[PDB]
Design a protein around this nucleic acid. Structure first.
Ligand SMILES: O=C(Nc1nccs1)[C@@H]1C[C@H]1c1ccccc1
Lengths: 409, 552
DNA sequence: TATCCCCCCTTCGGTGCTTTGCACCGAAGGGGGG
């Protein structure tokens, strides 16, 4: 189609981001891929007069041997003037959460047939560094729509609707929603027919314009309310920690009362002394346990805000997370467990947890969350590429204060 | 000559070229016409535009640089910010340790290549310069550049682009010939015989002459050693240029900074360099003319560095057929050294890590910071993360990463028994100790008065409150924990009402910037079993409410 | 009273929040080599 002019928001300039060092194999794969792309004309070499640069990384998606290019667009997406609101990215199916199976397809290759607006070509510049700084970085520039840019699906919307109209015509038993380069296809039918039907959808897309596969089950997802311990004999330390946990929960649930529980701790006993609960204490404990078991009331999604995701390390390969727009109005509390083969790699576990959380958040709300990783920035930036597989990247902030929380365990 | 293409350059939108007159100069330092200017006009590097280019720039002659060679250093400090921005594409500097075993090596130098690379036509007017003739008593004539100025903002990027464009066909036609091109140097090496290699060098020279760039034999270095960016290349050896440390009996802070800088520059091959004592003098310090006294520690450190540097040391070139191994040692006070090598006793590179990340940190965390640095340096210089040989025990590392609240990783390492070995001094308790003494510690301080109280109460009944002066609530909490630790036996259960203190002691530090924390760590390492617990404040929980009233 | 690059180091107001101190960090300058 014709190139839609793209301009930045007033008063702020294009991206200027340095390139993080890459390994020998990643650099070689990047050079070969970019040479092939330039031979096909999809990219053009550029000189020094362009003051823009975005980082580029090389990844290898699961169940494959070929390398895949990945260019960090975070800055350019944050700078681009509203190709998510003024363009068709607004509608999200509220029924996507309620599906037995959600499949993820790759449709990023279709974007390489639509040229980009010439006034915007200068902004999508990237550099390929060299080992030991032996040669200046081989700069390039995109001749077509770039993978990972938020305005790229906005431009390709008019063609994707036309391509997918027949499929929705014969088969209106599937809800379809794409986020950037990926297509989330979800059907409420039996899993055996679900896989065979995607092959037909893949066949329909193939001939009109790949053999991988993903599977999600959004129905089997539940919020995780906090639970108080259930013990018959209570020690002084155990009662104090329970009162602390209830004080933590009090900021979230207004119905919790700890007056009698605080009355029980009235003098100085040794931490290991056993205190038998009274009748009023048991009654208050039962009421508070029912309040905690009851799902949180008053949580509503607001599109005017942004999603913030917390991550805590619970030990022994187990992690928890919380998605919220306000610190005391959590929208989804969950838990992640170490998968087989990754029990001895914290960076790998956190990197896979980040992808799982962001995929779930996309499927549920259609807006990737702002992560708050419990890791050092330097080691994260060093090792997060070796384990990443998604073609999208969220915006994350780092925290160095200990969480101290057993509230989520 | 060849018509090497120019690069389009413009100013920043909405702002025009500068007009800066020249500061008063000296007749000895200047001339009626700066004699190089007319020769360069004849050569074609400068032309004359008088009436319709009402722009100017500061021009002076340098006496300090290049041994009073009187370089024409035209200053563009204003036009640099007045012009558009550029993206420099080269980030760092090549390291010989990343070089390979090449049988024949030749270093080519391109003299005044900047003045040989043409400049854009439109931007030529903005580089106008005029000079007074005699004692600033005559106006002189206004000239304008025709080629790349020396020291202009876009000059390095433009020259690198032009030179890589020139070198691209030759590199494409010969893949065995390796050609390092950094700024104004040209390292060319190969695995060919010496005669054929020199023949290829002559073809390279004739190619550049066809492109208008000349490599004079005055700077063309024929035989080894080849001085490269301050290093001494040999057939199977590399070494930094010989270093002359300041042997001055007196020591100013400026001389101390020179010493530490030259020691850092020598640290990449010489092992064992330490500068912590020489930088503790730099912190705070004084006026640069103040004769700074040297501590006994500082002078012992300088003597040790001198005895290290009095012998020559050398590195070795990379061999891609082998693996990279790096061993880390501990030097105390937060200093670490590593010796990246491939075969034993022949190390590719050496270095040090001595940064202090955070007010409260310990040996395990700092070793993780050291490995994570070495990793990124090895990536930059080789493209491969090396195999580590750490002193930390596998059990200790497992415990730390399994029980720490962050995500930490170390790529692949084997434990090496080289003291002082990194080990965790003390551990806290997960469950309260049976038959231990319980302390309720609390400290309340008013910031408007800069006073306060610190103490504790105990289940056995002993009580204590000490007045405080010029301290904050945090301090009072740390002091309360300190008293609880001091007055108790080898096993103690402490109840605290301060998440700040609870997090600091829970982080398990070994060294800290606070004498309070250092004393607490000493008490904890002396102790045998210690437990900490946190209760809410003003919650009426046992004797915590009473001790709060006492210390308020 | 030359430009630009990597690097080391200490000093700084600026935000998190862990509160109004404290921990933490990125932006400068002071050196080393280009
Ligand atoms: O030309 C060069 N030759 C050399 N080889 C070895 C030692 S000095 C230096 C790299 C040049 C430079 C100097 C100052 C400012 C900008 C650029």
């Amino acid at each position: 189609i014709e190139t839609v002019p793209v301009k930045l928001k007033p008063g702020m300039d294009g991206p200027k981001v340095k390139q993080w060092p890459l390994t020998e194999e990643k650099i070689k794969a990047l050079v070969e891929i970019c040479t092939e792309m330039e031979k096909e004309g999809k990219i053009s070499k550029i000189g020094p007069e362009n003051p823009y640069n975005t980082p580029v990384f090389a990844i290898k998606k699961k169940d494959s041997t070929k390398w895949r290019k990945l260019v960090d667009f975070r800055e350019l997406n944050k700078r681009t003037q509203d190709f998510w609101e003024v363009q068709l990215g607004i509608p999200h199916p509220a029924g996507l959460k309620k599906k037995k199976s959600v499949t993820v397809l790759d449709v990023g290759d279709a974007y390489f047939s639509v040229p980009l607006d010439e006034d915007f070509r200068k902004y999508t510049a990237f550099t390929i560094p060299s080992i030991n700084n032996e040669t200046p970085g081989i700069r390039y520039q995109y001749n077509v729509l770039p993978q990972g840019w938020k305005g790229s699906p906005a431009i390709f919307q008019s063609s994707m609707t036309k391509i997918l109209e027949p499929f929705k015509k014969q088969n209106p038993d599937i809800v379809i929603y794409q986020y950037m380069d990926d297509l989330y296809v979800g059907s409420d039918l039996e899993i055996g027919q679900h896989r065979t039907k995607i092959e037909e959808l893949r066949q329909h897309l193939l001939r009109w314009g790949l053999w991988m596969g993903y599977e999600l089950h959004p129905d089997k997802w539940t919020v995780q309310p906090i639970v108080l311990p259930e013990k018959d004999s209570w020690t002084v330390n155990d009662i104090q920690k329970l009162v602390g946990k209830l004080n933590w929960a009090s900021q979230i649930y207004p119905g919790i009362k700890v007056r009698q529980l605080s009355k029980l701790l009235r003098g100085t006993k040794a931490l290991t002394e056993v205190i038998p609960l009274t009748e009023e204490a048991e009654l208050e404990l039962a009421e508070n346990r029912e309040i905690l078991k009851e799902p949180v009331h008053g949580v509503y999604y607001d599109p005017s805000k942004d999603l913030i995701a917390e991550i805590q390390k619970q030990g022994q390969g187990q992690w928890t997370y919380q998605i919220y727009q306000e610190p005391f109005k959590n929208l989804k509390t969950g838990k992640y467990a170490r998968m087989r083969g990754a029990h001895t790699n914290d960076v790998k576990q956190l990197t896979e947890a980040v992808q799982k959380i962001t995929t779930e958040s996309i499927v549920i709300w259609g807006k990737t969350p702002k992560f708050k990783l419990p890791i050092q920035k330097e080691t994260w930036e060093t090792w997060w590429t070796e384990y990443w597989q998604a073609t999208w990247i969220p915006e994350w902030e780092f925290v160095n204060t200990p969480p101290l929380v057993k509230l989520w365990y | 000559i060849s018509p090497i293409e120019t690069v389009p350059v413009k100013l920043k939108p909405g702002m025009d070229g500068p007009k800066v007159k020249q500061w008063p100069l000296t007749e000895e330092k200047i001339k009626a016409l700066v004699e190089i200017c007319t020769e360069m006009e004849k050569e074609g590097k400068i032309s004359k535009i008088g009436p319709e280019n009402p722009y100017n720039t500061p021009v002076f002659a340098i006496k300090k640089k290049d041994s009073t060679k009187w370089r024409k250093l035209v200053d563009f400090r204003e036009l640099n910010k007045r012009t558009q921005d550029f993206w420099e594409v080269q980030l760092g500097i090549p390291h010989p340790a990343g070089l390979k075993k090449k049988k024949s090596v030749t270093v080519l130098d391109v003299g005044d290549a900047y003045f040989s690379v043409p400049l854009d036509e439109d931007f030529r007017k903005y580089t106008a310069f005029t000079i007074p003739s005699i004692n600033n008593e005559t106006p002189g004539i206004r000239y304008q550049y025709n080629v790349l100025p020396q020291g202009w903002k876009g000059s390095p990027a433009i020259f690198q682009s032009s030179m890589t464009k020139i070198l691209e066909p030759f590199k494409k036609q010969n893949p065995d010939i390796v050609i390092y091109q950094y700024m104004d140097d040209l390292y060319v090496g190969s695995d060919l015989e010496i005669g054929q290699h020199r023949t290829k060098i002559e073809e390279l020279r004739q190619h550049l002459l066809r492109w208008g760039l000349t490599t004079p034999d005055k700077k063309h270095q024929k035989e080894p050693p080849f001085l490269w960016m301050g290093y001494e290349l040999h057939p199977d050896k590399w070494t930094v240029q010989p270093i002359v440390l300041p042997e001055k009996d007196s020591w100013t802070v400026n001389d101390i900074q020179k010493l530490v800088g030259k020691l850092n520059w020598a640290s990449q091959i010489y092992p064992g360099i330490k500068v912590r004592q020489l930088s503790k003098l730099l912190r705070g310090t004084k006026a640069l003319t103040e004769v700074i006294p040297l501590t006994e520690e500082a002078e012992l450190e300088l003597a040790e560095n001198r005895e290290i540097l009095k012998e020559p040391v050398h590195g070795v070139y990379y061999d891609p057929s082998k693996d990279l191994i790096a061993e880390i040692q501990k030097q105390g006070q937060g200093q670490w050294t590593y010796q990246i090598y491939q075969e034993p006793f022949k190390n590719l590179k050496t270095g040090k890590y001595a940064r202090m990340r955070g007010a409260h940190t310990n040996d395990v965390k700092q070793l993780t910071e050291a490995v994570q640095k070495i990793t990124t340096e090895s990536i930059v210089i080789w493209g491969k993360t090396p195999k580590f040989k750490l002193p930390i025990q596998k059990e200790t590392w497992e415990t730390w990463w399994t029980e720490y609240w962050q995500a930490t990783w170390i790529p692949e390492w084997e434990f090496v028994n080289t003291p002082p070995l990194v080990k965790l001094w003390y551990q806290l308790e997960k469950e309260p100790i049976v038959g231990a003494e319980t302390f309720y510690v609390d400290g309340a301080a008013n910031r408007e008065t800069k006073l306060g109280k610190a103490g504790y109460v105990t289940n056995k009944g002993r009580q204590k409150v000490v007045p405080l002066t010029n301290t904050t609530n945090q301090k009072t909490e740390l002091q309360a924990i300190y008293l609880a630790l001091q007055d108790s036996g080898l096993e103690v259960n402490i109840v605290t009402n301060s998440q700040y203190a609870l997090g600091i002691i829970q982080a398990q530090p070994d060294k800290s910037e606070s004498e309070l924390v250092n004393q607490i760590i000493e008490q904890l390492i002396k102790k045998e079993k210690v437990y900490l617990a946190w209760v809410p404040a003003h919650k009426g929980i046992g004797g915590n409410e009473q001790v709060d009233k006492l210390v308020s």
